[PDB]
Chain A
Amino acid sequence: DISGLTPCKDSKQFAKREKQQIKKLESSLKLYAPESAPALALNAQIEKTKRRFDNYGKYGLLCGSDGLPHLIVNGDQRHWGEFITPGILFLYIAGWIGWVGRSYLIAISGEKKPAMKEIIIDVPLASRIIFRGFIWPVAAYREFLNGDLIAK
């Protein structure tokens, strides 16, 4: 119970929110015949709501006094999935994008009119460069060690 929080599965307000949403969804269903397509859509929405609430209950989130999940970003191992892992994934993807852009910019710097290759992309060269960014951390680290990363 970090900061006085409670698990989702033990919170009564969470169940009350689920019941209120389900009841609101079921009210509009009575206006349509069971075989009609809007009835099928509403049934699918109700099933999706139930599945979402069950999944939130299963993942061990923490609820406040209002029955809403809260995110812990202090580094506890019990909550590494809320902030740490997606952060690492985002950092990897952003580094990939930045490394690809920098490599493409460096490659065309020696051409006679480099500004022309920036508005009309050299597709084969970019495609050959795109796959290289999959190992961007190693290349960046070794470039830093050799003193090539920073312009003199």
Chain B
Amino acid sequence: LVDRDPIKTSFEEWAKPGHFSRTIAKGPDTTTWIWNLHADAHDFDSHTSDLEEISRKVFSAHFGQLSIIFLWLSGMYFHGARFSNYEAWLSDPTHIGPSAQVVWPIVGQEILNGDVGGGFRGIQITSGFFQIWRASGITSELQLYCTAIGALVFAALMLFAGWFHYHKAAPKLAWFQDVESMLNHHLAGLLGLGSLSWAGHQVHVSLPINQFLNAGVDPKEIPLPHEFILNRDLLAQLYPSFAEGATPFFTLNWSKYSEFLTFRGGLDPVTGGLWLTDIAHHHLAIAILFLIAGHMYRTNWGIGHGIKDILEAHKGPFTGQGHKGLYEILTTSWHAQLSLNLAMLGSLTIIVAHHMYSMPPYPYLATDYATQLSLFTHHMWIGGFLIVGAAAHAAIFMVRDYDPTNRYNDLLDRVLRHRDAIISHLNWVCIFLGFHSFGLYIHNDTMSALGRPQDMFSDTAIQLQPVFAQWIQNTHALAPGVTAPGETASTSLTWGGGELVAVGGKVALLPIPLGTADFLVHHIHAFTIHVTVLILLKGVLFARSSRLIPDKANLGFRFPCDGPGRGGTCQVSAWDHVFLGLFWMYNAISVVIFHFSWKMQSDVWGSISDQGVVTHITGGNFAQSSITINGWLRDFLWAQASQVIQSYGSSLSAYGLFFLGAHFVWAFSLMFLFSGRGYWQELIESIVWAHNKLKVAPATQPRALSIIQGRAVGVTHYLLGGIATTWAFFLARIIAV
């Protein structure tokens, strides 16, 4: 199912911009043509109506994405070998700050090459690559150079594959629609075999090298990874069970492998991370489970399941026919699959962000506060963006590919017939949550201002205790020995076990208390999430029609309005709902990251002394100061911003410059959001007049930006400015202290 040489390789189409569209290829009468060229670059569905060609175009771009990712990985690995102090950091991870970037001295920018330890001058990095390299057994820079070379080779291979599968042998449509085979392969081979290979690498390389490192041996005296394979005596000395070979595995005497395959739980006191034996056992079990899961769906040999057969058998007295017809929708529309995958990926990213901080998987990662904060905020933002994109593409599918005549589905029909109740109930829930979550903050502020601290919602006057979460913490703290007999310690130290882990005089992790403030902040999170969901679902559900504009589907997915009639019809399209929900996503993620930062700085992170007294960074003021808006403004925003505003003249002045630059970018966006196109089109007419006077009027007539373009520019600049401000503030605050 491939075609030989579908499209000739030529430079002819390079010299004719806009060849993908008939209208754009005509020529640039005005300046709107240039903007329209870029906005429709990757909309393959608008270029042609053939599903096979769209699938072939989609298949090739992923190869370019993979090549770009491989180039990025190659650069990251190469910079750590040539412009880094990784070897010096390896001998003292607790007193040296990782750095992998140096700057050329031209205009006085060499001040950014601050001292970081190990006789090195550079920029301190917070991506956590040093911990990953240490956990993999990497010791010298030659291995990093080899990894960079391999990544370059893989990027070249990906680029060649991308060219080949589009210009020499393009698969047919019947190849793409083999969902059962694709699922079987991506489950058994992509995931299970990868987990098995990583488990093997961890067993044979990471474990002995990491044990030698934790023993305190000089990294230059540790035997090379290949010495543990050729010389089984070394492994037998390290692990006696290796002397028996693979015989216990094939005789089901798996108890002999308990030395390097454990079920301990908790953190390693030496490094502050999870035990590597637990990780190896976890990867082995996950590989087995994924290998089993990949033999469910039917193929050329009869045995297995048919996804259509599974779907068609589920229906209920409330839902009618049920899931019949969903198989044909998901195997014919690219947008629905994209929306579902984007939503699932965003949720998974948020879950990963939440899980990484409380269960540190890398050595010397819990005590690196900047890395933890950066990873948390980065992954949360990525998850939010993916979640928004899911709804955007769901609306796109609803507008374009919906067709009840040939693709009828009962479940989709029933949802669209009672959307008013869903929207009204969601509106009521949002209003109730906003009143009963944010209103308690204003009450506390008013009572504090009036001089009545005894009438506030606080731990000392009127308690609002999160009794349900405390019960979960108590249950999980008592899990070992009762409901998890095979475990020695709890999964996390934050459950409330009472034990504290200190590495290098710093607090890695300890139980986290929950009080009245956590109740309020959690309900604030719920309120913001509910409002965002309301906006996106209202946008998706009313994409085709409404009581105001019955024929909204004919106007398309991205149109500005339908005139000033009916009192005003501004921003009625589904695109405008995504444009509006991006702001609320930004708001929710900012509140969440502020909560995380303040809570960790106030109740977890700190230093321990010889007598064992913990002194936190901010002194534990979160409980009594976060219950008012004035407290958030004073003890968090005003107090913690002194690091970034006093960074001039030092190696951290770049963050100080980025603070003001992001301020300017954020403030600059309000011009596009608060104004309209007619004023700017009328203003241009006067500017064109004087150019005509001096014979400098261009033939490409200048036109003001369209309404949609202006809204997009405004939202983009707004988001960029806000995120850059928060990034600069966080990094400047956390690197110094």
| Contact between chain A and chain B defined by CB under 8 Å | yes
Residues on A facing B (Cβ under 8 Å): 28, 31-33, 36, 38, 41, 44-45, 101-102, 105-106, 109, 113-116, 118-120, 149-151
Contact B27 A115 (CB under 8 A): yes
Which chain A positions have C-beta within 8 A of B696? 101-102, 105
Partner of B115 from A28, A109, A113, A116 at Cβ < 8 Å: A28
Decide: A151 near B699, CB < 8 A? Known: A32-B119, A115-B29: no
Contact A45 B110 (CB under 8 A): yes
Asked whether any CB of chain A lies closer than 8 Å to the CB of B692, the reply is yes
Contact A109 B121 (CB under 8 A): no
Asked whether any CB of chain A lies closer than 8 Å to the CB of B194, the reply is no
Which residues from 1 to 49 on chain B have a C-beta closer than 8 Å to any C-beta of chain A? 15, 17, 27-29, 34
Which chain A positions have C-beta within 8 A of B700? 115, 118-119
Which chain B positions have C-beta within 8 A of A113? 27
Partner of A109 from B27, B28, B699 at Cβ < 8 Å: B699
A106-B695, A151-B695 given; name 16 further pairs at CB < 8 Å: A31-B115, A38-B119, A41-B105, A41-B110, A41-B113, A45-B105, A45-B110, A105-B695, A105-B696, A115-B29, A118-B28, A118-B700, A119-B28, A119-B34, A120-B15, A151-B693
Bound-state CA distance A120–B700 (Å) is 12
Which chain B positions have C-beta within 8 A of A38? 113, 119-121
Contact B698 A118 (CB under 8 A): yes
Contact A151 B27 (CB under 8 A): no
Which residues from 220 to 277 on chain B have a C-beta closer than 8 Å to any C-beta of chain A? none
Q: Shortest CB–CB separation between residue A142 and chain B, in angstroms?
A: 16
Majority-rule SS of A interface residues: helix
Bound-state CA distance A100–B110 (Å) is 38
Contact B695 A102 (CB under 8 A): yes
9 pairs from A and B in contact (CB 8 Å cutoff):
A28-B115, A38-B119, A41-B105, A102-B695, A115-B699, A118-B699, A149-B694, A150-B694, A151-B692
Interface footprint category on B? 20 to 34
Nearest residue, chain B, Cβ from A118: B700
Which chain A positions have C-beta within 8 A of B120? 38
**Residue of B27, B692, B698, B699 ringed by the most chain A CB atoms within 10 A:** B699
Q: Can you list the 10 inter-chain pairs with the closest CB atoms, starting with the nearest?
A: A114-B699, A115-B699, A38-B121, A115-B700, A151-B695, A102-B696, A115-B28, A118-B700, A151-B693, A105-B696
Nearest residue, chain A, Cβ from B30: A115
Q: Shortest CB–CB separation between residue A36 and chain B, in angstroms?
A: 6
Which chain A positions have C-beta within 8 A of B15? 120
Which chain B positions have C-beta within 8 A of A151? 692-695
Nearest residue, chain B, Cβ from A148: B695
Bound-state CA distance A41–B104 (Å) is 11
Which residues from 81 to 122 on chain B have a C-beta closer than 8 Å to any C-beta of chain A? 105, 110, 113, 115, 119-121
Q: Shortest CB–CB separation between residue B84 and chain A, in angstroms?
A: 15
Q: Shortest CB–CB separation between residue A27 and chain B, in angstroms?
A: 11
Bound-state CA distance A7–B305 (Å) is 91
Bound-state CA distance A12–B15 (Å) is 65
B 138-163 to A, binary, CB cutoff 8 A, 1 in contact else 0: 00000000000000000000000000
**Residue of A41, A102, A106, A151 ringed by the most chain B CB atoms within 10 A:** A151
Bound-state CA distance A44–B696 (Å) is 50
Nearest residue, chain B, Cβ from A38: B121
Bound-state CA distance A101–B15 (Å) is 24
Contact A102 B121 (CB under 8 A): no
Contact B27 A116 (CB under 8 A): yes
Contact A36 B694 (CB under 8 A): no
Which chain A positions have C-beta within 8 A of B695? 102, 105-106, 151
Q: Shortest CB–CB separation between residue A84 and chain B, in angstroms?
A: 25
Partner of A102 from B27, B113, B694 at Cβ < 8 Å: B694
Bound-state CA distance A151–B17 (Å) is 34
Nearest residue, chain A, Cβ from B37: A119
Which chain B positions have C-beta within 8 A of A116? 27-28
Bound-state CA distance A102–B501 (Å) is 72
Partner of A36 from B27, B34, B119, B692 at Cβ < 8 Å: B119
Which chain B positions have C-beta within 8 A of A105? 695-696, 698
Nearest residue, chain B, Cβ from A119: B28
Which chain A positions have C-beta within 8 A of B692? 151
Which residues from 668 to 704 on chain B have a C-beta closer than 8 Å to any C-beta of chain A? 692-696, 698-700
Contact B693 A150 (CB under 8 A): yes
Which chain B positions have C-beta within 8 A of A109? 699
Nearest residue, chain A, Cβ from B114: A28
Bound-state CA distance A107–B105 (Å) is 44
Contact B699 A41 (CB under 8 A): no
Q: Shortest CB–CB separation between residue B247 and chain A, in angstroms?
A: 55
Bound-state CA distance A8–B121 (Å) is 34
Q: Shortest CB–CB separation between residue A33 and chain B, in angstroms?
A: 8
Bound-state CA distance A33–B119 (Å) is 9
Which chain B positions have C-beta within 8 A of A150? 693-694
Bound-state CA distance A36–B692 (Å) is 63
Which chain B positions have C-beta within 8 A of A106? 695
Nearest residue, chain B, Cβ from A116: B27
Bound-state CA distance A115–B32 (Å) is 13
Which chain A positions have C-beta within 8 A of B699? 109, 114-115, 118
Q: Shortest CB–CB separation between residue A16 and chain B, in angstroms?
A: 16
Bound-state CA distance A45–B695 (Å) is 51
**Residue of B17, B27, B121, B694 ringed by the most chain A CB atoms within 10 A:** B121
Q: Shortest CB–CB separation between residue A80 and chain B, in angstroms?
A: 26
Bound-state CA distance A149–B34 (Å) is 31
Nearest residue, chain B, Cβ from A98: B696
Which residues from 489 to 506 on chain B have a C-beta closer than 8 Å to any C-beta of chain A? none
Bound-state CA distance A25–B328 (Å) is 71
Q: Shortest CB–CB separation between residue B649 and chain A, in angstroms?
A: 8
Which chain A positions have C-beta within 8 A of B113? 38, 41
Q: Shortest CB–CB separation between residue A122 and chain B, in angstroms?
A: 14
Which residues from 388 to 411 on chain B have a C-beta closer than 8 Å to any C-beta of chain A? none
B 693-725 to A, binary, CB cutoff 8 A, 1 in contact else 0: 111101110000000000000000000000000
Which chain A positions have C-beta within 8 A of B698? 105, 118
Q: Shortest CB–CB separation between residue A112 and chain B, in angstroms?
A: 11
